[PDB]
């Protein structure tokens, strides 16, 4: 499945370079701008546990979520991750607990020590 296929030839999309966010592009965007610090940015998402069965179904599909890109307002991967998607694209996201929930988790839908799995898509971004 995506996950593997990420762990395997997912793009180590760090600072660090552990390959705690690794990125596949599923749907190329728009030209070459990228959201900057402190823009507001509008995805869709679908996110799981990565050894989950299925995408987490309790938010809006309809909905965008929006968020204010490098203010710590998500976890670290989506502030590290969204930076590098063009208005348009879609890619999957596939994170160590250290860029999530960590060892404290959310329980009861994130467990201590969660690796996790995101689709998300950038619909737009504004300064
Ligand atoms: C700076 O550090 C943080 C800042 C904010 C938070 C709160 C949770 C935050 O959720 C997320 O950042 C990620 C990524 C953006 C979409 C939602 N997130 C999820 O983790 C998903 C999760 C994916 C794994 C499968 C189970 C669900 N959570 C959600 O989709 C749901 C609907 C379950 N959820 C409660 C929210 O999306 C709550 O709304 C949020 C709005 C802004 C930031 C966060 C959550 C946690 C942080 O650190 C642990």
Redesign the pocket.
């Known amino acids: 499945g995506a996950p593997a296929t990420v762990t395997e030839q997912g793009e180590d999309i760090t600072s660090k370079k552990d390959r705690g966010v690794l990125k596949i592009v599923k749907r190329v965007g728009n030209g070459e701008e990228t959201p900057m610090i402190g823009d507001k940015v509008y995805v869709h998402?679908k996110?799981?546990?990565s050894n989950?069965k299925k995408f987490?179904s309790?938010?809006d599909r309809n909905e965008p979520?929006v968020?204010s890109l490098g203010k710590?307002?998500?976890?670290?991967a989506?502030d590290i991750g969204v930076a590098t998607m063009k208005k348009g694209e879609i890619a999957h996201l596939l994170i160590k607990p250290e860029y999530?929930?960590?060892s404290?988790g959310?329980l009861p839908?994130?467990p201590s020590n969660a690796t996790?799995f995101?689709e998300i898509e950038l619909l737009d971004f504004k300064g």
């Open positions: 998402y996110g799981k546990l989950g987490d309790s938010h979520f968020f710590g307002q998500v976890i670290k989506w999530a929930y960590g404290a959310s839908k994130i996790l995101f």
